[PDB]
Amino acid sequence: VPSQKTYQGSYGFRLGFLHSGTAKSVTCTYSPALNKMFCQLAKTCPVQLWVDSTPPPGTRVRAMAIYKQSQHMTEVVRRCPHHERCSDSDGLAPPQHLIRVEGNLRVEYLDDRNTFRHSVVVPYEPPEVGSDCTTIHYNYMCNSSCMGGMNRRPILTIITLEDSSGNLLGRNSFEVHVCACPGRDRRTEEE
Amino acid sequence: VPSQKTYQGSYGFRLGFLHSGTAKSVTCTYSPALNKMFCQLAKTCPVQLWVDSTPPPGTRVRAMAIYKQSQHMTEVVRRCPHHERSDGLAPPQHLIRVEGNLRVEYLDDRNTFRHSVVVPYEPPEVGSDCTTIHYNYMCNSSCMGGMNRRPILTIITLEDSSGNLLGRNSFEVHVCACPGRDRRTEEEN
Amino acid sequence: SVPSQKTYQGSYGFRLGFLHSGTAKSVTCTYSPALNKMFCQLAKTCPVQLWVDSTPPPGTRVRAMAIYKQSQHMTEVVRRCPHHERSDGLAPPQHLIRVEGNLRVEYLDDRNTFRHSVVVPYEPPSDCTTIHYNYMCNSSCMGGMNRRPILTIITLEDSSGNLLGRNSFEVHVCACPGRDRRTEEEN
Amino acid sequence: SVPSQKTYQGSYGFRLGFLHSGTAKSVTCTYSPALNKMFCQLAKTCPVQLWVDSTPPPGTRVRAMAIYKQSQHMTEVVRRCPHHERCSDGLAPPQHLIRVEGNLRVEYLDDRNTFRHSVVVPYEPPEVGSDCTTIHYNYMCNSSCMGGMNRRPILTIITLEDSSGNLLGRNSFEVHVCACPGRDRRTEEEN
Ligand SMILES: *C[C@@H]1C(=O)C2CCN1CC2
Ligand SMILES: *C[C@@H]1C(=O)C2CCN1CC2
Ligand SMILES: *C[C@@H]1C(=O)C2CCN1CC2
Ligand SMILES: *C[C@@H]1C(=O)C2CCN1CC2
Ligand SMILES: *C[C@@H]1C(=O)C2CCN1CC2
Ligand SMILES: *C[C@@H]1C(=O)C2CCN1CC2
Ligand SMILES: *C[C@H]1C(=O)C2CCN1CC2
Ligand SMILES: *C[C@H]1C(=O)C2CCN1CC2
Ligand SMILES: [Zn+2]
Ligand SMILES: [Zn+2]
Ligand SMILES: [Zn+2]
Ligand SMILES: [Zn+2]
């Protein structure tokens, strides 16, 4: 069972999220009170990476989903049989993988040989000129309600910073809810 | 014994029914308080499919009847001997038919022997918010050699083109001559 | 064409009554005899009393239906606005008028007029029977009533649907019924 | 692009009230009716009362936003100074000038098109017996902060909005944040 313990590590690795509000039309929104991201099926979910000092070149950024409830934590999070069916829009990603990265041609996907867990990794890139953080656009490819997939079970996304050799540099996590109206879901859950 | 657990699933699948009232002339009427449809032998029984987003083409909608009481739940629901003795498409033993759909498909489960009927899912028409399937029940709830006054539950399942279950809902049915009167009388309790 | 609004006391002497609630700031609903008009709040209890001179037979029913008062809008179906349509597990989301606290309530979408109504069994009483109506839209709801006055028509029907009596009253749904009634009665 | 500051009592008779705190030396906040101007200390409670003629619909929300008062600064976004905006933040974004204290349902917005900051809380009707609702605001920079407001006067705009975001009411007041509100109010009223 993968570790979810927060670790800023030596580079001061933290996650940030846009302050999007909860209007009805918002496509994603993060709740600080719940440390919970609310996003829509296969739509952009921006995650910011904040560091104290720049990690070495070749540093990588990995995302992995796990079930939040301890009696489900041993089950690998995957797409439901319905959505895992191949389509013409899978592109670079394995059809079973819940978490994709959008807009990064150097994305890499892993089925772990021993643990069978899915993850997606991209190169760490420093913020652009005039920016203080690096943003990754994740996509979640099932709904929280999917029968035969997550099946209403809550999940966490674990983001790890690792060096080119795979050693842990830092780790942080957040809960994710994938549904049609993130603004309403967040406003209702905070109530 | 097939599952009856309600799941809206990824597409927000739920059932809806016309608000038909209980006047004498009504040939079908649904009771929200009882989650129970009252309809007439071999007459139109419209069931609406409501979804929060559109399932892809190839999606299918299956209906199956089971007995509601656990004493009878392992017995296959079928027409009585009298009413078996068609439309050319439906097996004579099946209680539930779909009318007005040339793409209807009927299944005798090879292992459980249960009957079901399945049509392609079609999205709502222009201006409508739901898809309607016209079911026909081919036996009276009181048919001696069939249901014999035992209550039944109709299970509606949404499945994708590969057979994966997408969602499920159900309702009780009562088939008899005067649906309006039967719904009024049963709601007095 | 438009459903009849003409008063009819019928064989049972059917009339409506309303509480004499006054117009204090606290009142959640109040009826104006001078305007034959009920002032109530969104989704809150709006009590209507049924008065009869003799008891209707068992199986008698009581229907409520909203119609626009002005001749220019009389043929348009009164419905909830799109906002409020987006509850109780029994009422259709498009219906403006609900009945609260009656598990035997029945809702009708008329197959040919498309008009909405809500019906409950008539129960004998007290010296009157009370039905708690809820109005699920404001009178000013854009895309719904949109500041067009409505009437509620109350009909008494036998078990076979024959009319036994009919009465009506105007309805205004807004935030402060006491203030609204006092203001409208001033002018 | 500049938000409206036009006072709009709207259909519910929306008005702002303030405590009658006086100008003693030790007062931590004080409002000047003559100036329609609040004087408060950095990061200290600033009570603002909401008064309505009739109770707004369930799901109503109350938004606060700061803008510069002078015409030649009105297009600049009001934000915290670099010194103060360094990451006690709790639920609030570090760049936001205005926080709400003591409300776990608070929501912060970075407008995606205008880039302006605001903070929104649910409208709660007054408790049975009370005539008004109070929100506790905190201003997280001084008026004098170099790089931040940099001695420029600001207005706070309070908007009442329905659950869908439609304008129900608007009011505003000037704000001066400094160490001794009593002395600053008394002195500014001397002129
Ligand atoms: C953290 C970075 C920035 O500096 C701005 C706002 C959010 N990201 C991208 C642009
Ligand atoms: C659900 C749909 C609609 O939108 C109307 C009423 C019932 N069906 C067909 C037409
Ligand atoms: C319920 C059924 C019917 O449809 C008629 C009346 C009573 N039974 C037998 C015949
Ligand atoms: C008609 C009945 C009564 O007997 C009184 C007045 C109104 N309702 C309830 C109390
Ligand atoms: C009648 C209605 C209300 O409830 C408020 C005040 C006046 N109109 C519009 C909003
Ligand atoms: C005017 C209205 C009312 O009728 C009650 C008391 C004061 N406001 C809000 C609810
Ligand atoms: C659809 C299926 C294939 O045909 C290959 C590509 C994607 N998926 C696994 C192997
Ligand atoms: C509305 C305001 C008052 O009038 C006092 C009681 C409640 N609130 C604070 C002081
Ligand atoms: Zn899925
Ligand atoms: Zn039969
Ligand atoms: Zn409305
Ligand atoms: Zn500062």
Numbering used by the authors:
A (entry chain B): 97 to 287
B (entry chain A): 97 to 181, 185 to 288
C (entry chain D): 96 to 181, 185 to 223, 227 to 288
D (entry chain C): 96 to 182, 185 to 288
Q: Which of the paper's sentences describe this entry?
A:
The human p53 tumor suppressor is a 393-residue protein that in response to cellular stress, acts as a transcription factor by binding as a tetramer to a wide range of DNA response elements, activating various events including DNA repair, cell-cycle arrest, senescence or apoptosis. Mutations in the p53 gene were observed in more than half of human cancers. To uncover the structural basis of rescuing p53 mutants by MQ we investigated by X-ray crystallography high-resolution structures of the core domains of mutant and wild-type p53 bound to MQ in the absence and/or the presence of their DNA response elements. These studies reveal diverse binding modes of MQ to specific cysteine residues that stabilize the proteins and their interaction with DNA.
The crystal structures of R273H and R273C incorporating covalently-bound MQ were determined at a resolution range of 1.71–2.05 Å from crystals with four independent p53DBD molecules. In the crystal structures obtained by the soaking procedure referred as R273H-MQ (I) and R273C-MQ (I), bound MQ has been identified at residues: C182, C229, C275 and C277 in both structures, as well as at C273 in R273C-MQ (I). MQ-C229 conjugates are observed solely in the crystal structures R273H-MQ (I) and R273C-MQ (I), obtained by the soaking procedure. Well-defined MQ-C275 conjugates are present in two p53 monomers of R273H-MQ (I) and one monomer of R273C-MQ (I). Bound MQs is observed in monomer A, and both enantiomers (with partial occupancy) in monomer D of R273H-MQ (I) (respectively). These conjugates form several stabilizing interactions, including hydrogen bonds made by the carbonyl oxygen and the tertiary amine of MQ with N239 and with S241 side chains, and with the backbone amide of A276. Additional MQ-mediated contacts include CH···O and VdW interactions with the side chains of Y107 and S106 from neighboring monomers, respectively. These interactions stabilize MQ-C275 conjugates in monomers A and D of R273H-MQ (I). Unlike the other MQ-modified Cys residues, the current MQ-C275 conjugates are not compatible with DNA binding because of their predicted close proximity to DNA. C277 is located at the protein-DNA interface and involved in base-specific interactions. MQ-C277 conjugates were identified in four monomers, one in each of the four crystal structures, shown in Fig. 4a–d.
